[PDB]
Motif scaffolding. Structure first.
Motif, PDB file in Angstrom:
ATOM      1  N   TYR A 108       0.808  -1.201   0.000  1.00 35.80           N
ATOM      2  CA  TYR A 108       0.000   0.000   0.000  1.00 35.80           C
ATOM      3  C   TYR A 108       0.842   1.251   0.000  1.00 35.80           C
ATOM      4  N   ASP A 109       0.277   2.316  -0.541  1.00 34.07           N
ATOM      5  CA  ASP A 109       0.935   3.609  -0.637  1.00 34.07           C
ATOM      6  C   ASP A 109       0.609   4.467   0.574  1.00 34.07           C
ATOM      7  N   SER A 110       1.601   4.738   1.418  1.00 32.93           N
ATOM      8  CA  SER A 110       1.345   5.492   2.637  1.00 32.93           C
ATOM      9  C   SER A 110       2.389   6.557   2.928  1.00 32.93           C
ATOM     10  N   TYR A 137      -4.415 -13.703   8.625  1.00 31.07           N
ATOM     11  CA  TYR A 137      -3.946 -12.456   8.054  1.00 31.07           C
ATOM     12  C   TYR A 137      -4.422 -11.290   8.907  1.00 31.07           C
ATOM     13  N   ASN A 138      -3.478 -10.513   9.442  1.00 28.79           N
ATOM     14  CA  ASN A 138      -3.760  -9.333  10.259  1.00 28.79           C
ATOM     15  C   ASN A 138      -2.792  -8.220   9.911  1.00 28.79           C
ATOM     16  N   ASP A 139      -3.178  -7.304   9.036  1.00 22.75           N
ATOM     17  CA  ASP A 139      -2.204  -6.314   8.614  1.00 22.75           C
ATOM     18  C   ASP A 139      -2.194  -5.079   9.487  1.00 22.75           C
ATOM     19  N   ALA A 140      -1.311  -4.158   9.146  1.00 18.35           N
ATOM     20  CA  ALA A 140      -1.174  -2.918   9.869  1.00 18.35           C
ATOM     21  C   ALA A 140      -0.890  -1.822   8.883  1.00 18.35           C
ATOM     22  N   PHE A 141      -1.550  -0.699   9.062  1.00 19.36           N
ATOM     23  CA  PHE A 141      -1.377   0.392   8.142  1.00 19.36           C
ATOM     24  C   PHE A 141      -0.527   1.460   8.792  1.00 19.36           C
ATOM     25  N   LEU A 142       0.454   1.976   8.070  1.00 15.46           N
ATOM     26  CA  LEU A 142       1.283   3.038   8.617  1.00 15.46           C
ATOM     27  C   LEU A 142       0.515   4.350   8.660  1.00 15.46           C
ATOM     28  N   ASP A 174       1.779   7.045  10.852  1.00 16.92           N
ATOM     29  CA  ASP A 174       2.777   8.059  11.180  1.00 16.92           C
ATOM     30  C   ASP A 174       4.177   7.559  10.839  1.00 16.92           C
ATOM     31  N   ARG A 175       4.734   8.078   9.753  1.00 14.92           N
ATOM     32  CA  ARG A 175       6.023   7.614   9.260  1.00 14.92           C
ATOM     33  C   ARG A 175       7.203   8.079  10.085  1.00 14.92           C
ATOM     34  N   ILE A 176       7.142   9.295  10.603  1.00 16.96           N
ATOM     35  CA  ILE A 176       8.297   9.853  11.294  1.00 16.96           C
ATOM     36  C   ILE A 176       8.686   8.989  12.480  1.00 16.96           C
ATOM     37  N   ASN A 177       7.705   8.537  13.252  1.00 20.96           N
ATOM     38  CA  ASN A 177       8.029   7.665  14.377  1.00 20.96           C
ATOM     39  C   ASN A 177       7.538   6.236  14.141  1.00 20.96           C
ATOM     40  N   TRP A 178       7.317   5.890  12.874  1.00 18.66           N
ATOM     41  CA  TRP A 178       6.855   4.563  12.465  1.00 18.66           C
ATOM     42  C   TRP A 178       5.790   3.933  13.354  1.00 18.66           C
ATOM     43  N   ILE A 179       4.627   4.566  13.385  1.00 22.65           N
ATOM     44  CA  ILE A 179       3.488   4.049  14.126  1.00 22.65           C
ATOM     45  C   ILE A 179       2.447   3.524  13.159  1.00 22.65           C
ATOM     46  N   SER A 180       2.006   2.308  13.412  1.00 23.60           N
ATOM     47  CA  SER A 180       1.014   1.676  12.560  1.00 23.60           C
ATOM     48  C   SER A 180      -0.164   1.195  13.374  1.00 23.60           C
TER      49      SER A 180
END
Ligand SMILES: *[C@@H]1O[C@H](CO)[C@@H](O[C@@H]2O[C@H](CO)[C@@H](O[C@@H]3O[C@H](CO)[C@@H](O)[C@H](O)[C@@H]3O)[C@H](O)[C@H]2NC(C)=O)[C@H](O)[C@H]1NC(C)=O
Ligand SMILES: *[C@@H]1O[C@H](CO[C@@H]2O[C@@H](C)[C@@H](O)[C@@H](O)[C@@H]2O)[C@@H](O[C@@H]2O[C@H](CO)[C@@H](O)[C@H](O)[C@H]2NC(C)=O)[C@H](O)[C@H]1NC(C)=O
Ligand SMILES: *[C@@H]1O[C@H](CO)[C@@H](O[C@@H]2O[C@H](CO)[C@@H](O)[C@H](O)[C@H]2NC(C)=O)[C@H](O)[C@H]1NC(C)=O
Ligand SMILES: *[C@@H]1O[C@H](CO)[C@@H](O[C@@H]2O[C@H](CO)[C@@H](O)[C@H](O)[C@H]2NC(C)=O)[C@H](O)[C@H]1NC(C)=O
Ligand SMILES: *[C@@H]1O[C@H](CO)[C@@H](O[C@@H]2O[C@H](CO)[C@@H](O)[C@H](O)[C@H]2NC(C)=O)[C@H](O)[C@H]1NC(C)=O
Ligand SMILES: *[C@@H]1O[C@H](CO)[C@@H](O[C@@H]2O[C@H](CO)[C@@H](O)[C@H](O)[C@H]2NC(C)=O)[C@H](O)[C@H]1NC(C)=O
Ligand SMILES: *[C@@H]1O[C@H](CO)[C@@H](O[C@@H]2O[C@H](CO)[C@@H](O)[C@H](O)[C@H]2NC(C)=O)[C@H](O)[C@H]1NC(C)=O
Ligand SMILES: *[C@@H]1O[C@H](CO)[C@@H](O[C@@H]2O[C@H](CO)[C@@H](O)[C@H](O)[C@H]2NC(C)=O)[C@H](O)[C@H]1NC(C)=O
Ligand SMILES: *[C@@H]1O[C@H](CO)[C@@H](O)[C@H](O)[C@H]1NC(C)=O
Ligand SMILES: *[C@@H]1O[C@H](CO)[C@@H](O)[C@H](O)[C@H]1NC(C)=O
Ligand SMILES: *[C@@H]1O[C@H](CO)[C@@H](O)[C@H](O)[C@H]1NC(C)=O
Ligand SMILES: *[C@@H]1O[C@H](CO)[C@@H](O)[C@H](O)[C@H]1NC(C)=O
Ligand SMILES: *[C@@H]1O[C@H](CO)[C@@H](O)[C@H](O)[C@H]1NC(C)=O
Ligand SMILES: *[C@@H]1O[C@H](CO)[C@@H](O)[C@H](O)[C@H]1NC(C)=O
Lengths: 488, 99, 97, 77, 485, 68, 103, 105
Positions: free
Chosen positions: A332-334, A394-399, A401-407
């Motif tokens: 995915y594009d995040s 299957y249990n995904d996670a969406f990003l 907050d990129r700066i502190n890598w929170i999903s």
């Protein structure tokens, strides 16, 4: 009496459900599309018609001649970023706007949910009888818009629904949004699930191209199907789409996928199998567990399918960093860059996802996550010892907050079984906060998380397959969770 | 994530090599050192657009195939190579001296 | 946009507001006699930063809140505006024990 | 009294539901779709009539001009 | 245990589905259409106000340079065929499917209403379980006349009101005014006031329905009014009586009939055109005023005037020129002037209508129509002009479509003794120009209401005809042709 | 076998119809109505921002002035 | 029977004349009235609902089921026969007998 | 908007045609606003045709007409003794309203 029921009531009830479950929803969905199309036309008309400049003007004898909903984008959206124990997430059910709840005689399986540019793709398979053995009734694949309801909550409104001629031959669909169309790539099979029956699978694919803004007479526009044989498999014997969503890059569509490689064509060095920290592990298990059984013919290797819209499918394998069995993937594009997630159905039970360093070949900087892990039986949660198994969810996670890598996403908080779905927001080595979606003794399976920005606020829609306590079947439920800025 | 500046010295063409992340998806910026922003270059999706501080003498360019960014300066201080992530200058290199 | 700069705090005031998209684009950095390290990005949101570092603000008025300040927190601190390009920084201040 | 339930409680309502679902509801949706198209046309027509502005060249020498270090003005003849 | 399954698993669901499909969904669709219409107006207003400007002073360098679809059938000489022909140039398309008028099983739709003005319509009917039976419900509502995709007018409802008890609501009449459609109804505990007049209380109620409702309009959408003051003059009781009325500024004029005591009423046996009939006697001209020669009250037509800036309702009497028993009547706003129509259930069977010369008192320039006549029993059959004592007939409208030649249109029943064979006709006082059947000759019909309007500057007429098949209404959208070929 | 028609053909369909008629259909209509309002706001905002008639300051040192 | 009767028709140049049209057989208050002279159109007056707007020295007015034309500052060019007319949906369907005006 | 009308028409039993040309189109709404009148000495002009081809009250079948845009005509056939009259075309669309030919045996 027998004749009245069979002649006066039955036939009418049959016509009524056709009208209420298919034609009316379809006409409403289209009506909604017309609203979008008119809005765009009007705004364009104003933009083009009310564009003006000052006229050339004169000095005496001389004349002067002069020359609502979007994806997560590179914007500093704030979230709570502290470890807390209070209750700050408040999930909403928005499943009521989709045709997901049917009669008690059926079960809903194999859900898909994907989102981009304010649009979504959604699908599910409806079975009659048991969730694992029932005959397919229909498979519903369609698209729509992510709308703002009056409560300042997202809601999913379908505008275009497609069905296959044969629900029992359509498997493992994935989807990518591109230029007001949503491309759904499905495997075609006459032998059932290609993963379970890999040796008799024909290997062909089909693509369903759906408009996200259909026209009333769009017979060749609203939907179109392509047969795909022009597949570049490289070293692989068979190639299949395998995951709920993909990404776009210009006019190129990248779908999640798995290649089927005959074991004798597979190379692996046993010295790279992590036996060093586990006294019961065998160095050979890391190869055996690449299939769905020690004596399977093919190994399942993850990768992507690259389809060029300016028109053949290229299989792109994933590199062998932290190599594991191919299970449903998601790309995915995040926040400006593709992020790759790969489910784990084998001995490495830790959540496995990360930053995409490159797409072709696919290389993922897997995050060293030690707090999120899938449930299991042989291969229990937080297990890191090589073992032979093929199980999991299957249990995904969406990003978000990129700066502190929170999903964020939904995980099943039990180490022995697939139960107790909880929506969590986490750091690779910590969990910041969470909220329970269903009780501890409630079972659950697949979850799909898709996040977006609604009026600059982060929302995550989590699709969770939850077993009801009545007829013991699963129905996808959509939990719309707002991610708060404050930690209270 | 590492950003390594070079090309400094006494006079300028500076360079920065990126490692640990995918270079082509991020905005690259030069800042000199209080702190003053100098120039920005964006990726293909932004048509490689650029911006300059009102140095606007300087040219900023990039080459994604080499995972690197360059600054041509046709001013004394320490020049830093930075990554701008969701509009924030989250990563800085060690910096190179220009004098 | 012009930027002017136990428990201790550092204040920064913008000549123009930095609030848009529901976000106040006011970042804070710590620079030891080293490159600048991100502490806070946008109003009140910690970077990849000890819990002693926090902050708040809106419009034009923002502050960095450090508590407790320790011996290893002696540094230059800067406020940054990231709503518009050109980007701007405050002159910066030195905070010491 | 199964016959009574089918003839009195179910029949009279199933038939009406059928008519409403297959005729009157779809008909109103279709008309509503027509309303959208008509509203769209009305709005675009209103814009065309009310935002189609253009003007001829202005005469600076016949306009009231205010400059630094301005000159006195008495008449235009 | 099958009876329990039907009564517990299906029954309750069928009942809820029926409520949702016939009431809630149509209501939500109607309101959605209203939201669209309201937003369209808002957008046009925004453009009208915001896109208006004057040139600004132009600053150059340092110097500031300051430089110097459906509308009512009114006002147009529309083109129609006005020659007599014998071909088929009428196209009576059926549009009834867009209204909740299609019943099932033993469901009778009777006493229909249909009114139109400024692109909006009112519609009403009574559902019964058709001669004698239990009333189920009374449905009164409003909507818009829309341009359908194929350039055919269609009726889309946006706002529906029902009474708490349909057995008390009789002879409702509608008038459009200021985006509301006012419906004046008689309230009775003795049934239809016309037949049970000696025990009627005489009270009236009015319902004000928005034609462009709001989602939470409340009293905005369905206001309930009561008339606390009725100015009857010489009449004992008065009531609304007929399809629709007109608006004049803030005053609404509804078709009405007054109940006058027979012994107060006066007449003149020597002032009746009875000398041309060899089989009658002078008192027939007076006895015919009641529903029977020995009734307590007689019926006389008129209007009920309702002033929105007062409010009381005032009964207005009509002139005695061609006086007949008060029968259902209608007043049109057509081509710039009010036109009055009166049904004739009296011995004078000829169509009775014409231009209104004055409203109060109501004086009508009845047309010299020698061609159109309603059906009736052998006591007073079609084309009868002999004063006789009788009381029966049907309502057949005649909307004016072209004033210069006084050409009107409506649906008439082409039969002498029975109410049968509805035909849409376009006619002049002394001629029929063209005809088209709306049903076979063996199909009977009763009340016919016609409302004409312009759609994209062309004349269309919607005729609401009660056609037997239990009897149900059908609505025919008939285009009026420009050519006679 | 009266119960066979009620049990497997009609019962299940009536339940399915109930869900569509009372929940998904009116939910989509209500949601669509919200969409109508969103579209309205978008159009009015577009007019307010784009139909505004105003001019920027003009500098004519870059313009070609045609004189006799 | 619809009829328009004109009266009030030799007046010397610079003087004035007033033409009075008596309307009967129709609802005067609902129709536009016009004057035409012999053909040339002279003046039009609208209804009360149109705020008695007018189109054209002359003034046109309405009241008595009647319409009037006030002709001031008369000239020889005004010589001809004046007719009172009634307009139905833009069409001059009805004309009076006409009155002769000489200047 | 002004009108030009032509031909005198020295035409019994023969078809007479009279033309009228508008300086501007008079056909808004799809409705012609070109009217025709018949006038005789001692009498006011009587409406013959309003708009295009629509006969007025009491007008004989002998009178017809057609037209669109700026090109309109009156068609009289057969011409009889009672049809000897002045004929006029009228512009009734816009203010000022405007208006003849002699038709005889
Ligand atoms: C994987 O797919 C293959 C191919 O479809 C499956 O093999 C097929 O299985 C069917 C039964 O389900 C066989 O049909 C039966 O054959 C017997 C004769 O042996 C006959 O008596 C029955 O009436 C019926 O016709 C079919 O022949 C067989 N085809 C092949 C090529 O073997 C296989 O079972 C699937 N495996 C799994 C795990 O699903
Ligand atoms: C239907 O009736 C008309 C006339 O009406 C009847 O006769 C009137 C004189 C009067 O008594 C009414 O009350 C009656 O209902 C019939 O038309 C007449 O036919 C005769 C014979 O050809 C002719 O001499 C008359 O002039 C006609 N009058 C009119 C007005 O047309 C007609 O024939 C009857 N049709 C049927 C099917 O019975
Ligand atoms: C998708 O197909 C297009 C076809 O045009 C490719 O674009 C061409 O790429 C080659 C390099 O291999 C260039 O030399 C051409 O000039 C390009 N043509 C155009 C019109 O741009 C595109 O590279 C393909 N993309 C992917 C991911 O396969
Ligand atoms: C320029 O300024 C003069 C005043 O110096 C304006 O003159 C006015 O003109 C109006 C008529 O349009 C008169 O009613 C005022 O009384 C005049 N003002 C004075 C003080 O006499 C002139 O209109 C201005 N021109 C422009 C284009 O703004
Ligand atoms: C006129 O109205 C009266 C009053 O309702 C009717 O008389 C009643 O009839 C019912 C039976 O249906 C009796 O139970 C009441 O006791 C009667 N009341 C009185 C005062 O007599 C009368 O029948 C009606 N007339 C007609 C023709 O219907
Ligand atoms: C039809 O003809 C009758 C005559 O038989 C008309 O009645 C006359 O109308 C005029 C105009 O208002 C009055 O001046 C006469 O006094 C009336 N005559 C009588 C005897 O009362 C009637 O108005 C005509 N109706 C139509 C529509 O033309
Ligand atoms: C004013 O006139 C000059 C002279 O024609 C224009 O100069 C041209 O500029 C273009 C763009 O750079 C060149 O390609 C041409 O070759 C130039 N012409 C000549 C003769 O040298 C200038 O662009 C005009 N300016 C404006 C505002 O119209
Ligand atoms: C300013 O521009 C206008 C453009 O309309 C010039 O007018 C035209 O000039 C050309 C070229 O000489 C002639 O052929 C045209 O006949 C002129 N038009 C008219 C209506 O006369 C105008 O001459 C220019 N002004 C100056 C000073 O050059
Ligand atoms: C596998 O790893 C061992 C490590 O001892 C090495 O000697 C061997 O050559 C490797 N084989 C391959 C094919 O890489
Ligand atoms: C995870 O740890 C490995 C070392 O075992 C490292 O190579 C990799 O880059 C780390 N992941 C991330 C996202 O830094
Ligand atoms: C799961 O296993 C872990 C082992 O680290 C233990 O701490 C936890 O309490 C267990 N929970 C359950 C439900 O078994
Ligand atoms: C032009 O107008 C501005 C206000 O918009 C004013 O401040 C300025 O002084 C004016 N220029 C002159 C020469 O007066
Ligand atoms: C009224 O009746 C009388 C007879 O009593 C009669 O002479 C008179 O003419 C009648 N009135 C009219 C208008 O005929
Ligand atoms: C209605 O009442 C107002 C206010 O008194 C009055 O001006 C108007 O003339 C009345 N309407 C009629 C038709 O009399």
């Amino acid at each position: 009496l027998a004749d009245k029921i069979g002649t006066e009531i039955g036939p009418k009830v049959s016509l009524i459900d056709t009208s209420s479950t298919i034609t009316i929803p379809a006409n409403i969905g289209l009506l909604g599309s017309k609203i979008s199309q008119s809005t765009a036309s009007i705004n364009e008309n104003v933009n083009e018609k009310c564009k003006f400049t000052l006229p050339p003007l004169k000095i005496h004898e001389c004349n002067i001649s002069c020359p609502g909903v979007s994806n997560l984008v590179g914007l500093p959206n704030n979230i709570c970023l502290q470890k807390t124990s209070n209750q700050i997430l408040k999930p909403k059910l928005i499943s009521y706007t989709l045709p997901v709840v049917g009669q008690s005689g059926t079960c809903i399986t194999d859900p898909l949910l994907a989102m981009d540019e304010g649009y979504f793709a959604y699908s599910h398979l409806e079975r009659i009888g048991s969730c694992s053995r029932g005959v397919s009734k229909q498979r519903i694949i369609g698209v729509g818009e992510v709308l703002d309801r009056g409560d300042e909550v997202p809601s999913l409104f379908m505008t275009n629904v497609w069905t296959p001629p044969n629900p029992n031959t359509v498997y493992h669909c994935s989807a990518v949004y591109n230029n007001e169309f949503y491309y759904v790539l499905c495997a075609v099979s006459t032998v059932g699930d290609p993963i379970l029956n890999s040796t008799y699978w024909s290997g062909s694919l089909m693509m369903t191209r759906l408009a996200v803004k259909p026209k009333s007479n769009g017979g060749g526009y609203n939907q179109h199907q392509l047969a795909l044989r022009s597949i570049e498999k490289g070293r692989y014997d068979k190639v299949m789409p395998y995951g709920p969503s993909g990404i776009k890059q210009g006019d190129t569509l990248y779908f999640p996928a798995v290649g089927f490689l005959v074991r004798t064509e597979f190379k692996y060095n046993d010295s790279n199998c992590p036996i060093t920290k586990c006294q019961y592990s065998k160095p050979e298990n890391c190869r055996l567990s690449m299939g769905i059984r020690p004596n399977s013919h093919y190994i399942l290797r993850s990768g992507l399918l690259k389809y060029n819209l300016s028109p053949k499918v290229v299989f792109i394998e994933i590199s062998d960093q932290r190599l594991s069995i191919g299970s449903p993937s998601k790309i995915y594009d995040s926040l400006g860059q593709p992020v790759f997630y790969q489910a784990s159905f084998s001995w490495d039970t830790m959540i496995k996802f990360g930053d995409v360093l490159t797409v072709n070949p696919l290389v993922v900087n897997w995050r060293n996550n030690t707090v999120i892990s899938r449930p299991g039986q042989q291969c229990p949660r937080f297990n890191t010892c090589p073992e032979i198994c093929w199980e999991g969810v299957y249990n995904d996670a969406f990003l978000i907050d990129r700066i502190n890598w929170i999903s964020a996403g939904v995980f099943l908080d039990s180490n022995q079984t697939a139960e107790n779905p909880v929506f969590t927001v986490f750091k690779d080595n910590e969990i910041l906060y969470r909220a329970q979606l269903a009780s501890e003794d409630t079972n659950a399976q697949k979850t799909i998380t898709n996040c977006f920005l609604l009026k600059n606020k982060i929302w995550c829609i989590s699709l969770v397959e939850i077993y009801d306590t009545g007829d013991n079947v699963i129905r996808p439920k959509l939990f719309a969770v707002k991610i708060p800025e404050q930690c209270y | 994530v590492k950003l390594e500046e070079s090309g400094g010295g006494l006079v300028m063409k500076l360079s920065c090599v990126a490692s640990g992340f995918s270079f082509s998806y991020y905005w690259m910026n030069w800042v000199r050192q209080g702190l003053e922003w100098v120039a920005e270059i964006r990726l293909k999706s932004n048509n490689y657009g650029t911006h300059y501080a009102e140095v606007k003498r300087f040219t900023i360019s990039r080459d994604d195939s080499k995972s690197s960014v360059y600054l041509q300066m046709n001013d004394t201080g320490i020049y830093y190579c930075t990554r701008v992530i969701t509009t924030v200058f989250a990563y800085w290199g060690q910096g190179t001296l220009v004098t | 946009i012009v930027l002017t700069q136990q428990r201790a705090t550092i204040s920064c005031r913008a000549s123009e507001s930095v609030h848009d998209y529901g976000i106040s684009f006011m970042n804070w950095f710590q620079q030891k006699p080293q490159p600048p390290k991100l502490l806070i990005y946008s109003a009140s949101n910690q970077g990849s930063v000890p819990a002693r570092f926090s902050g708040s603000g809106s419009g034009t008025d923002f502050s960095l809140n450090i508590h407790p300040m320790e011996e290893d927190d002696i540094a230059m601190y800067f406020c940054q505006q990231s709503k518009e390009v050109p980007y701007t920084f405050g002159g910066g201040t030195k905070l010491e024990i």
